């Protein structure tokens, strides 16, 4: 299914890592990113 892979996913998405670096968030954080 789709789920965060890193425990810091929220820590990175809350900083905009998905808005800024979605290339590695989509591969680690799905919900935190626009994947779920």
Separation between Cα atoms, residue 28 and residue 36, nearest integer Å = 12
Q: Which domain holds residue 17?
A: 1-36
Give how far Cα 20 sits from Cα of 1, 10, 12, Å: 24, 14, 10
Judge whether 24 and 9 are in contact, CB under 8 Å.
Answer: no
Q: How many domains does the chain have?
A: 1
Experimental method: NMR
* Dihedral (CA of 30, 6, 11, 22) sign: negative
Instruction: Locate 15 and state its tokens.
Output: 């900083």
């Amino acid at each position: 299914v789709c789920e965060d892979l890193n425990a810091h996913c929220e820590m990175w998405q809350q900083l905009g890592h998905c808005q800024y670096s979605p290339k590695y968030m989509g591969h680690y954080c799905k919900k935190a990113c626009g994947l779920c």
